[PDB]
Amino acid sequence: DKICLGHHAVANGTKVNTLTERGVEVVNATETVEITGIDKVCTKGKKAVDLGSCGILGTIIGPPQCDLHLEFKADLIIERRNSSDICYPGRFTNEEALRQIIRESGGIDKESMGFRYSGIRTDGATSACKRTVSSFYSEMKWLSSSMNNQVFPQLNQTYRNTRKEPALIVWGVHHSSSLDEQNKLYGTGNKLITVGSSKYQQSFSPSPGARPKVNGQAGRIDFHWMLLDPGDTVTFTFNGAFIAPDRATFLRSNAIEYNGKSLGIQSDAQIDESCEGECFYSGGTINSPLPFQNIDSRAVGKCPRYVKQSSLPLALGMKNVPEKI
Amino acid sequence: DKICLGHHAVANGTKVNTLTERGVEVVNATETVEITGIDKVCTKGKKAVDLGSCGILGTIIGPPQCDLHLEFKADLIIERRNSSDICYPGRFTNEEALRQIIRESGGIDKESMGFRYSGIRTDGATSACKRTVSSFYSEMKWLSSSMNNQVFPQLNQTYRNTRKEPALIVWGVHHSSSLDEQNKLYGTGNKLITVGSSKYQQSFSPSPGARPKVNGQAGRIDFHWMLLDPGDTVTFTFNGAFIAPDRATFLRSNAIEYNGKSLGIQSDAQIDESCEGECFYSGGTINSPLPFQNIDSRAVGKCPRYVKQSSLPLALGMKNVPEKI
Amino acid sequence: DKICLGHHAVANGTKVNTLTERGVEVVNATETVEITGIDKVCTKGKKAVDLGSCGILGTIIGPPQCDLHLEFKADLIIERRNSSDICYPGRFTNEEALRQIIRESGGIDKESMGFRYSGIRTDGATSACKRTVSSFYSEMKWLSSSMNNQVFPQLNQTYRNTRKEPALIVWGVHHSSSLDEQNKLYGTGNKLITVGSSKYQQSFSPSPGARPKVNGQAGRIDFHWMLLDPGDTVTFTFNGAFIAPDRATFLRSNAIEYNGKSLGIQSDAQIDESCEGECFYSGGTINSPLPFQNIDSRAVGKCPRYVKQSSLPLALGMKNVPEKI
Amino acid sequence: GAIAGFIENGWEGLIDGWYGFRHQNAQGQGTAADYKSTQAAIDQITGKLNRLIEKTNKQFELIDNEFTEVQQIGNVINWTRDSLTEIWSYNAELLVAMENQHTIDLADSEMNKLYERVRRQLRENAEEDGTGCFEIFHRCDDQCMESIRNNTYNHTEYRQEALQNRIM
Amino acid sequence: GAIAGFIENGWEGLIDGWYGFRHQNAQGQGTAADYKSTQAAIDQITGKLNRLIEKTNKQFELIDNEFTEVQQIGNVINWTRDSLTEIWSYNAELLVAMENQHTIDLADSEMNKLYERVRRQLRENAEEDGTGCFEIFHRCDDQCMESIRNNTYNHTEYRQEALQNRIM
Amino acid sequence: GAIAGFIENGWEGLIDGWYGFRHQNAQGQGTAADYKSTQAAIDQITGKLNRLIEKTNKQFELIDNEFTEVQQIGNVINWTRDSLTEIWSYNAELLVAMENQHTIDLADSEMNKLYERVRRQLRENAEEDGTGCFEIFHRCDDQCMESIRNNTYNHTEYRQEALQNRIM
Ligand SMILES: CC(=O)N[C@H]1[C@H]([C@H](O)[C@H](O)CO)O[C@@](O[C@@H]2[C@@H](O)[C@H](O)O[C@H](CO)[C@@H]2O)(C(=O)O)C[C@@H]1O
Ligand SMILES: CC(=O)N[C@H]1[C@H]([C@H](O)[C@H](O)CO)O[C@@](O[C@@H]2[C@@H](O)[C@H](O)O[C@H](CO)[C@@H]2O)(C(=O)O)C[C@@H]1O
Ligand SMILES: CC(=O)N[C@H]1[C@H]([C@H](O)[C@H](O)CO)O[C@@](O[C@@H]2[C@@H](O)[C@H](O)O[C@H](CO)[C@@H]2O)(C(=O)O)C[C@@H]1O
Ligand SMILES: *[C@@H]1O[C@H](CO)[C@@H](O[C@@H]2O[C@H](CO)[C@@H](O)[C@H](O)[C@H]2NC(C)=O)[C@H](O)[C@H]1NC(C)=O
Ligand SMILES: *[C@@H]1O[C@H](CO)[C@@H](O[C@@H]2O[C@H](CO)[C@@H](O)[C@H](O)[C@H]2NC(C)=O)[C@H](O)[C@H]1NC(C)=O
Ligand SMILES: *[C@@H]1O[C@H](CO)[C@@H](O[C@@H]2O[C@H](CO)[C@@H](O)[C@H](O)[C@H]2NC(C)=O)[C@H](O)[C@H]1NC(C)=O
Ligand SMILES: *[C@@H]1O[C@H](CO)[C@@H](O)[C@H](O)[C@H]1NC(C)=O
Ligand SMILES: *[C@@H]1O[C@H](CO)[C@@H](O)[C@H](O)[C@H]1NC(C)=O
Ligand SMILES: *[C@@H]1O[C@H](CO)[C@@H](O)[C@H](O)[C@H]1NC(C)=O
């Protein structure tokens, strides 16, 4: 007698949207926008370093809080909020661009720049860099007269980049608390530092004066840097106010000292080495099957696309047509 | 005998475009791109202020032309072209970012910062700020020696933000016409202003000298500002060249002194309180049913999307197939 | 007995992609992404100038290497890599914005600014600008005392833009190698240059000192410019260190001295006047039928859209269904 | 004097409906709009325009200034604003073309829906003439046409008559 | 007690297939899923979601800073990031709507594919009833139904019987 | 030795047309391209490629420099240019996929258009065989085939012969 053709249905289906229409009911659907993150940085199978209190620029010059990261090796570099790049007050020139460099280095290697000295005080210290006792940047030397109010010598230092990787070279300029204090440490006269590369040439004079007291000190130390091509010499020339480099920084993704290319994330979250993750934000990790996320615009790494919507339901079966009596 | 099925047609229809083809004729169509604006700012049901000649930064310091807007309350703030933020020549530091603040405040409230003085001239005036007679910024005090060539005292002023909203605090630095004129007004010596917050600390010295004559004056006054968190003190310290604040500015969208969040538009058009509008540009208002506009890229508010095309015809009925003989 | 309907097929067809599916085999297809460029700048039917060694800013002031381009007329302007805008070491203020101007001028016209002099040396030269003998910028005059260590006069120069097109006016400030050498050339005293327009007013003082030796010279010359509206006067006032303009530059797309609007490209490639092209990059020319290119993100002119993909195959015939036994 | 359906022709004289029937029998000719299938087309097309707004409207403020310009930063803002404009112009144009293809196709679908409805309603009592029309092989008066139109035609009532007219 | 196909109704009781046959003959009623045409629908829909990732996923790094902000440059970065977000939000939403239209339409197509298959298989031995069903004009037992289902029905075996039931 | 239409198969031997007829009668076999419905497919596909240019081509100039770089501003220009590239790459790829779906579908439509044309032309003189072919129930010589091909077949001439072959 008779044969019918047909398709399945269910009692309640889920509403999706099409180009034409809104709220079409289908048999099956799945979400496409991830709203839920993993509140941990997931480092499983990655080499990670939590810098904790150590600001990342600190791993180059070496304040007390960065003592465990002077040479470090990492695929994933985690910066924290309360972190500080310095002890003795002052800041880096063109900092934000030096960070982005260290963040994607894979870690930094350190080597001694060879400098020796004569008839100078090179062991200058500060209650601002305290270890067991007043100390100073582990990778820098503070250079003073060796006798108070003695005038400081005119000196030249050269260092030549031997390695096939470009070198990070940092130096500082000390800004005394007043014109009196500069005289005490470097003597009277005109103070001039000049730094010369084959691409770089700048000169610096201290600007002494009463600044607000930070970390107990009214003086400042300002750091500057340059990238030194292989086979190139940097020339240091100075008669005072000079914070000199004792080691040069070499990136590890330029070399078994090698460790290719890192991602630097900024996060407030505990590390978890048990979960796997490729995309990170300040709350932790996004690890989802879904193509989009609503969690954070500023996620970094291998990430779902950020979208304003918290839901975009995708159909996985046909339009649901309920059965009739 | 016979039955036909069919659809309507019209004699001439309008051409639209599809993905596949260009110039398909349909029965009915509508434009989607708005090309015609309303040459008025439409403020119906909104609280608007036309600042006219008053530049918006002027509502903080208070030149003669801003006298009616020192405290004002607005959802919609209209800036004009010929407007000026000052009378006595000079400019604001980081101005463009102070404007965007006042533009979205909902209006500003003013309160007295409490400062009193001793053995100073505080009533300094200028032919540049004329009211009935030579005058000065209604919210500022010009501080001079009280006797010509007398040296100006070293003074400290503190003000503490009491309110739960952050405070706008403005101050100025006077730059005399020559080194002679500075001596007349503040006396000889080194002139230094220092301003101290818990997040802010800057210091300013006058730079005296012969500038071009603007508004009849070769001197300058430069204004600076900061935002003061609740329960924080600003510290004023100075021995001359100081234009002091007499009132602090508080935003109204941070408080019935309250008036949430404003839109600041720049427009050449008369106000009309009879039409309604949400999107504005320099020629007036865009109020359209249409999803796109071709009028101005730089429209602000709740706006149709700007597009390069002046026409994108949408079909509202079927492909038009003319009847055959 | 029987009739069938059918469509063609071929033995092997090419795989394309649809929205739904990947690798659908069709009968015919064409590439849409251009991967192959023309390694020449194709100027057929265009007026082109290869500046070669002449940096484009040099066509205004006129070092030896720009001698053939002081007045030039071009639809297409080609800059080269090793090019230099100057001979005597120093740089332009706000350079990148002066380049973009000359690049789209259609060429520059030159006219004498009328200046004459009295009791000065105006024929200053330099081993840095060598022609037959030590020379100087062809469009500038170096102004010195006329007797060593004589103090230099206080002088005023006015030039009024007569033409209906805005004028390019360049001037320089000489920075002597030391305070001694400034004294030799301009005499002792305070050195001040002031430049005054109706929109522009700036002043410049030399900053003398030992800089590194470039092109054999430790001094510097720094050039500055302004755009002068028709009927406006520039006012030069100076008592030394002044590199003065001898000719003003007028753009040709503002005028048969006329030549509308140019495109400035930067390219490493030989010129070929036999091929036609509208889109250029550093490797030459893109001239393709295709709507997209994978060659270079930074192409300029009338260009295919750059895309990351090296292939997006377009179908030009139907889905290929091979015949069955 | 002859009548043809949609397969060749649109009807300039159908002025109170989008879709409709035209017939022929002893009584003479007639045309009638169809309300249900006209309204279903209209329903899918009203709400366009509003949907173009939902999808493409936004809220923003000033980032550059017209009465006092902010030049290095401003030359990139101008360039980025212009770039975003080209993207949104491509998008709007694509959206309208897409919406237009959908209107034209949905209208074709309601015409075919309705013809397929009538075809399966006449069963074996009628034959397709190729022009969007059915030749009916029984005698079909004005109150039988309405029967076909309002979907209450009982094809059995007329089957044997139709088959003696169809076969012989 | 009566049975109807897809043209009106979906079947809440078809629980081991997407598409299927329901029948009626002397033996009684029956329902059977269809594996091939169910699997072909499932195949086109698995691999969605993965295709949304291919098309919209990316690799990037930090350009602004959260623990120490970089303000003139940062007010434009915020504005450009927000602008790109609106573009990608419009795109994602459009992509899902497009994918959803394609799922719904492809499912309709496998149902019509299958009905057209059976229609052309029964030839002249059956007639469409309008609800997605064929009235069969010969005696069709359970092992003849399976014949229609597994695509081995020989319409010739039953043709003369059908035509004496159809015409008279 | 047997012939089948499009429902299973494409024809590797149809080399002067996109669409076509293949036949069978006492005279023997034959194949003929169809000009009108081939050209209509070709017309909709030429003009692609040009339409991809209209929709996606532009005019721009230099904003950064290669021979002397402009770094804070340049690190954002690089980032914004890269971001716009991803948008345009998503767009181009989507546009080609869309165009490709439309080519494949329009070709299917001209094949179905043409089969539906022939079906409604043969009326009751022929029956669908399921493979894209019609079994014709009268004697149909080479000059009658051309009649069906050039759309001048008068189904009435052959109706009674067909019906005595169809029913008995
Ligand atoms: C190398 C050296 O002399 N280091 C000093 C250091 C410097 O003298 C000074 O910071 C230059 O800015 O100052 C140290 O602290 C001292 C304080 O204890 C003191 O009470 O004030 C001093 C100046 O008046 C000086 O600040 C320091 O850094 O802690 C002592 C250190 O030996
Ligand atoms: C507070 C005070 O002394 N105000 C003066 C003001 C200042 O002396 C001066 O602007 C500092 O820049 O100058 C006033 O105008 C004067 C002119 O009338 C005059 O012809 O030149 C004076 C200096 O030589 C001074 O500019 C003014 O602002 O109008 C007078 C005012 O009392
Ligand atoms: C106008 C003039 O005097 N030009 C000098 C020029 C300037 O004196 C100097 O460059 C200012 O920066 O210098 C010229 O070269 C000289 C060298 O030959 C010399 O060995 O050192 C001089 C200063 O000690 C001076 O540099 C030059 O530009 O070549 C000579 C020229 O006449
Ligand atoms: C119906 O859709 C659901 C998705 O909502 C599919 O189920 C997922 O199936 C995979 C493995 O098949 C599991 O990893 C997921 O966890 C399931 N998702 C959830 C949240 O349950 C299911 O396969 C689909 N089935 C049909 C027949 O459509
Ligand atoms: C045909 O299209 C027009 C739009 O061009 C529709 O008319 C608009 O109708 C609304 C109210 O229905 C009015 O507010 C508008 O002003 C009309 N537009 C204009 C400019 O006239 C009309 O509804 C459509 N009718 C049909 C049957 O398609
Ligand atoms: C098949 O597609 C090809 C494109 O691959 C078409 O051939 C191009 O044809 C134009 C002129 O017709 C020539 O300028 C091109 O050089 C050809 N392209 C190449 C690379 O060969 C051809 O027209 C299409 N033919 C059919 C019937 O589809
Ligand atoms: C169709 O017509 C026949 C004539 O007997 C009748 O019995 C039947 O109820 C009618 N209605 C339907 C829907 O079959
Ligand atoms: C159909 O049935 C007839 C009955 O004779 C038979 O000869 C034939 O082989 C069957 N199969 C096909 C596919 O025709
Ligand atoms: C069809 O054939 C019949 C045979 O009499 C004829 O009268 C008629 O004119 C033919 N043409 C058409 C289009 O009906």
What is the C-alpha separation between F44 and F102, in angstroms, rounded? 10
Domain membership of residue B116 as a residue range? 47-269
- Cβ–Cβ under 8 Å, residues D72 and F73: yes
Cα C147 to averaged position of ligand 3 atoms, centre (Å)? 15
Sheet containing A292-293: order of strands: A33-34, A292-293, A305-306
Ligand closest in space to the Cα of A243: 1
Tokens of C76: 């297409």
Radius of gyration of chain E (CA): 27
The pairing of strands C305-306 and C292-293 is parallel
Pairing of strands B22-26, B271-272: unpaired
Two tokens, residue D71: 């030049």
Best of F46, F51, F53, F59 to disrupt the B interface (most B CBs within 10 Å) is F51
Same domain, A13 and A141: no
CA distance A197 to A224: 13
**Residue C131: CB partners within 8 Å, gap ≥ 6?**
C64, C67
Q: Is A97 on the interface with F (CB under 8 A)?
A: yes
Q: Report in angstroms the alpha-carbon separations of C38 from C262, C268, C285, E161, F61.
A: 21, 12, 5, 76, 20
| E12, E35, E42, E62: best to mutate for the A interface, most A CBs within 10 A | E62
The number of residues in chain D equals 168
Angle between helices F74-122 and D74-122 (to 10 degrees): 20
The answer to whether B305 contacts chain D (CB < 8 Å) is: yes
What is d(CA A65, CA A55) in angstroms, rounded to the nearest whole number? 8
Closest CA to F43 of F94, F93, F92, F110: F110
Residue F55 at interface with chain B, using a CB cutoff of 8 Å: no
User: Is the domain of B315 the same as that of B232?
Assistant: no
B192 neighbors B203 (Cβ within 8 angstroms)? yes
Residue C53 and residue C154 share a domain:
yes
At which of B251, B269, B287 does a domain end?
Answer: B269
Chain C neighbours (≥3 Cβ pairs under 8 A) are D, E, F
Q: For residue F86, give both structure tokens.
A: 């991803």
Structure tokens at C89: 């070491």
User: Residue A73 and residue B135: Cα distance in Å, rounded?
Assistant: 67
Verify whether ligand 9 is closer than 6 Å to residue F157 (CB atom): yes
Residue F164 CB–ligand 9 contact under 6 Å: no
Strand partners, F134: C3, F128
Spacing, Cα E49 to ligand 4 middle (Å): 12
**Ligand 4 atom showing the smallest separation from residue E46 Cα:** 23
The beta strand positions in chain E, using DSSP E, are 19-25, 28-33, 58-60, 126-128, 133-136
Q: Which helix (H) or strand (E) holds C175?
A: strand C167-175
Taking each helix axis from N to C end, the angle separating E74-122 and E35-45, rounded to the nearest 10 degrees, works out to: 170
Query: What's the token pair of residue C55?
Result: 């940096």
What number of CA atoms fall less than 13 Å from residue A61's CA on the CB side? Answer: 32
Q: How far is CA E24 from CA E29, E98, F107, in A?
A: 5, 39, 39
DSSP C195-213: EE-SS-EEEE---------
Q: What angle do CA F44, F50, F56 make, to 5 degrees?
A: 125
User: String of b and e for B68-104 (b: at least 16 CB within 10 Å)?
Assistant: ebbbbbbbbbbbbeebebbbbbbebeebbebbbbbbb
Q: How far is F152 from chain A (nearest CA, A)?
A: 37
Cα–Cα dist F23/F30, whole Å? 5
The residue whose two tokens read 């003189």 is F125
Q: Please tell me if the CB atom of residue D152 comes closer than 6 angstroms to any atom of ligand 7.
A: no
Q: Which chain F residue has its CA at the smallest distance from C16's CA?
A: F100
Sign of CA dihedral C74, C79, C83, C86: positive
Q: Are B59 and B108 in contact (CB under 8 A)?
A: yes
Read off φ and ψ for residue A185, nearest 5 degrees. Answer: -85, -35
Distance of CA B236 to the CA centre of its chain: 27
In contact, B9 and B27? CB cutoff 8 Å: yes
Q: Are residues A153 and A228 in the same domain?
A: yes
Q: For tokens 């204090």, what's the residue?
A: A181
- Report the number of distinct structural domains present in chain C: 2
C-beta atoms of E20 and A6 within 8 A:
yes
Nearest CA-CA distance, residue F17 and chain A, Å:
36
Q: How far is the CA of B126 from the centre of ligand 2 (A)?
A: 6
Which among B9, B45, B42 has a CA at the least distance from the CA of B28? B9
Per the DSSP assignment, residues forming a β-bridge with A226 are A169
- Read off the tokens for B113: 């910062």
Instruction: Report the C-alpha gap between C267 and C263 in whole angstroms.
Output: 12
Contact yes or no for A6/E3 (Cβ under 8 A): no
User: Which one, of E53, A322, E80, lies nearest residue D64 by Cα?
Assistant: E80
Sign of torsion, CA A7 A8 A12 A15?
negative
DSSP secondary structure code for residue F48 in this structure: B
Min Cα–Cα distance to chain F from A262, Å: 19
Provide the greatest CA pair distance for chain C.
119
Structure token pair of residue C297? 């993100």
Both tokens assigned to B261: 């969040």
Q: What is the domain-level CATH number for residue D60? A: 3.90.20.10
Radius of gyration of chain D (CA): 27
Q: Which two tokens stand for residue A63?
A: 């304040």
Q: Is F49 exposed, middle or buried (0-12, 13-18, 19+ CB in 10 A)?
A: middle
Helices (H) and strands (E) in chain D, counts: 5, 5
- State the Cα–Cα distance between residues A79 and A76, nearest whole angstrom: 10
Q: Kindly identify the ligand whose nearest atom is closest to the C-alpha of D135.
A: 9
Half-sphere exposure of C54 (CA within 13 A, CB side): 22
Hey, is B42 helix, strand or coil?
Answer: strand
Residues 6+ apart with CB under 8 A from B243: B137, B140, B141, B142, B143, B171, B172, B173, B174, B221, B223
A28 lines ligand 4 (CB under 6 A): yes
Burial class (CB in 10 A: 0-12, 13-18, 19+), C231: exposed
Pick from A147, A224, A237: nearest CA to A186: A147
What secondary structure letter does DSSP report for E27? T
Inter-residue contact E114 to E37 (CB < 8 Å): yes
**Token pair in block for residue B39:** 């040459």
Domain extent, residue D11, equals 1-168
Atom of ligand 6 nearest to the CA of C30: 5
Largest CA distance in chain B: 119
How many other C-beta atoms are found inside a 10 Å radius of the C-beta of residue D143?
8
**Does the CB atom of residue C144 touch ligand 3 within 6 A?**
yes
**b/e map of A280-303 (b: 16 or more CB within 10 Å)?**
bbebbbbbbebbbbbbbeebbbeb
Residues A15-51 as b or e (16 or more Cβ within 10 Å = b)? ebbbbbeeebbbbbbebbbbeebbebbbbeebebbbb
A63 and A110 assigned to the same domain: yes
**How far apart, in Å, do the first and last CA atoms of chain C sit?**
22
Q: Give the number of C-alpha atoms closer than 13 A to the C-alpha of residue B249, restricted to the C-beta side.
A: 30
- Total count of domains within chain F: 1
- For B67, which DSSP code? G
Distance CA A282, CA A284 (A): 6
Experimental method: X-ray
CA of E151 to the centre of ligand 8 (A): 14
What residues contact residue D25 under an 8 Å CB cut-off, 6+ apart?
Answer: B1, B2, D139, D140, D141, D142, D144, D145
Angle among Cα F103, F109, F112 to the nearest 5 degrees reads 150
Restricting to C residues 41-80, those with a Cβ less than 8 Å away from any Cβ of F are 79-80
> Alpha-carbon dihedral of residues B182, B186, B187, B193, nearest 10 degrees?
-90
Closest-CA residue to C159 (of C214, C219, C111, C87): C111
Using CA positions, which residue lies closest to atom 5 of ligand 4? A30
Cβ separation F104–C18 shorter than 8 A: yes
If you ran DSSP here, which 8-state letter would residue F104 be given? H
Cα C276 to ligand 6 centre (Å): 22
Same-domain status, A53 and A170: yes
Cβ of residue F16 lying under 6 Å from some atom of ligand 9: no
* End residue of a domain, out of B232, B250, B269: B269
Q: Which helix or strand (DSSP H or E) is residue D113 part of?
A: helix D74-122
F19 bridge partner residues: C7
CA–centroid distance, A146 to ligand 1, in Å, is: 14
How far, in Å, CA of E121 to CA of E152, rounded? 9
Ligand nearest to the CA of E157: 8
Tell me which residue has its CA closest to atom 5 in ligand 6.
C30
* CA distance to A36, A42, A277, C71, per residue, from A273 (Å): 19, 6, 10, 69
Q: Is E98 on the interface with C (CB under 8 A)?
A: yes
Which residues have CB under 8 Å from C198's CB, separation 6+?
A: C229, C232, C233
Q: What is the DSSP string of F6-37?
A: TTT--BTT--S-SEEEEEEETTEEEEEE-HHH
Q: Computed from CA positions of residues D4, D6, D12, D16, in that sequence, does the dihedral angle turn out positive or negative?
A: positive
Region at C249 (left for phi over 0; alpha for psi -120 to 50; beta for the rest): beta
Among all residues of chain E, which has the CA nearest to that of D162? E167
Asked whether residue C295 falls in the same domain as residue C164, the answer is no
Residues B226 and B304 in one domain: no
**Binary contact (C32, F67; C-beta < 8 A):** no
Written as six digits, the tokens of F12 are 């590797």
Burial C105-128 (b: 16+ CB within 10 A, else e): bbbbbbeebeeeeeebbeebebeb
Which whole-number Å values give the CA distances from C222 to C84, C85, C173, C219, in the listed order? 14, 12, 5, 10
The answer to whether residue C309 neighbours chain E at the CB level (below 8 Å) is: no
Q: Residue D112 in 3-state DSSP?
A: helix
Closest CA to E34 of E22, E10, E17: E17
Helix (H, G, I), strand (E, B) or coil at B24: strand
Q: Say what the alpha-carbon torsion angle B313, B315, B321, B323 is, to the nearest 10 degrees.
A: -100
Reduced to 3 states, what is the DSSP secondary structure of residue F53?
helix
Of all residues in chain B, the one with the smallest CA distance to E87 is B305
Q: Identify whether residues B106 and B253 lie together within a single domain.
A: yes
Q: Does D12 touch chain B (CB under 8 A)?
A: yes
Q: What is the rounded CA–CA span in Å between residue F165 and residue F154?
A: 18
B251 in the same domain as B103:
yes
| Distance, C-alpha D143 to centroid of its chain | 28
Which residues are CB-neighbours of A114 under 8 A, at least 6 positions away? A159
For residue E12, the chain A residues in CB contact (below 8 A) are: 8-11, 322-323
**F48 Ramachandran zone, left/alpha/beta (phi>0; psi -120 to 50):** beta
User: Which among B237, B269, B301 is the end of a domain?
Assistant: B269
C-alpha pair distances (Å), B8 with each of A304, D11, D130: 49, 5, 19
| Alpha-carbon separation of residue E113 from A6, C20, E44, F36 (angstroms) | 12, 18, 15, 27
Q: Is the sign of the CA dihedral D32, D35, D40, D42 positive or negative?
A: positive
Residues near E108 by beta carbon (within 8 Å), at least 6 away in sequence: A318, A319
**DSSP reduced 3-state for B315:** strand
Residue F38 backbone zone (phi > 0: left; psi -120 to 50: alpha; other: beta): alpha
Tokens for A36? 């839920």
Q: Which tokens hold the place of C57? A: 């800013």
Ligand 1 pocket, residue A235 CB under 6 Å: no
Domain holding A107: CATH number?
A: 3.90.209.20
For helices F74-122 and F35-45, the axis angle rounded to 10 degrees is: 170
* Subunit contact A19:D98, Cβ cutoff 8 A: yes
CA F154, CA B247: separation in Å to the nearest integer?
A: 100
Q: Are residue C61 and residue C7 in the same domain, yes or no?
A: no
How many angstroms separate the Cα of B161 from the Cα of each of B98, B114, B139, B226, B232? Answer: 19, 11, 17, 12, 5
Positive or negative torsion for Cα D141, D143, D147, D153: negative
Ligand 1, atom nearest to A177 Cα: 12
Phi, psi angles (nearest 5°) of residue F127: -135, 140
* Residue of A100, C26, E41, C140 whose CA lies nearest to F100: C26
Question: Cβ(F156) to ligand 9 under 6 A?
Answer: yes
- The Å distance, Cα F121 to ligand 9 centre, comes to 13
Closest to B159 measured CA to CA, from B225, B96, B235, B217: B235
> What's the rounded Cα separation, in Å, for the pair B162 and A254?
55
Same domain? B75 vs B203:
yes
Q: Is the dihedral of CA F1, F4, F8, F12 positive or negative?
A: positive
SS in 3 state form for chain A? CEEEEEEECCCCCEEEECCCCEEEEECCEECCEECCCECCEEECCCCEEECCCECCCHHHHCCHHHHHHCCEECCEEEECCCCECCCCCCCECCCHHHHHHHHCCCEEEEEECCCCCCCCECCCCEEEEECCCEECCCCEEECECCCCCCCCCCEEEEEECCCCCCEEEEEEEEECCCHHHHHHHHCCCCCCEEEECCCCEEEECCCCCCCCCECCECCEEEEEEEEECCCCEEEEEECCCEEEECEEEEEHHHCCCCCCCCEEEECCCCEECCCECCEEECCEEECCCCCEECCCCCCEEEECEECCCCCCCEECCCECCCCCC
Alpha-carbon distance of C241 to C175, in angstroms, equals 7
Tokens of C278: 């509208």
The alpha-carbon radius of gyration of chain C (Å, integer) is: 29
Tell me if residue B83 falls in helix, strand or coil. coil
Report the C-alpha gap between B18 and B309 in whole angstroms.
16
Which residue matches tokens 């047309």? F17
What are E21's two structure tokens? Answer: 């046959």
Identify the CATH number of the domain in which residue A41 sits: 2.10.77.10
Query: Chain D closest CA to F120's CA: distance in Å?
Result: 5
Q: Rounded to whole angstroms, how far apart are CA atoms C278 and C41?
A: 10
What is the maximum alpha-carbon separation in chain D? Answer: 92
Question: Hey, which residues does A48 pair with through a beta bridge?
Answer: A76
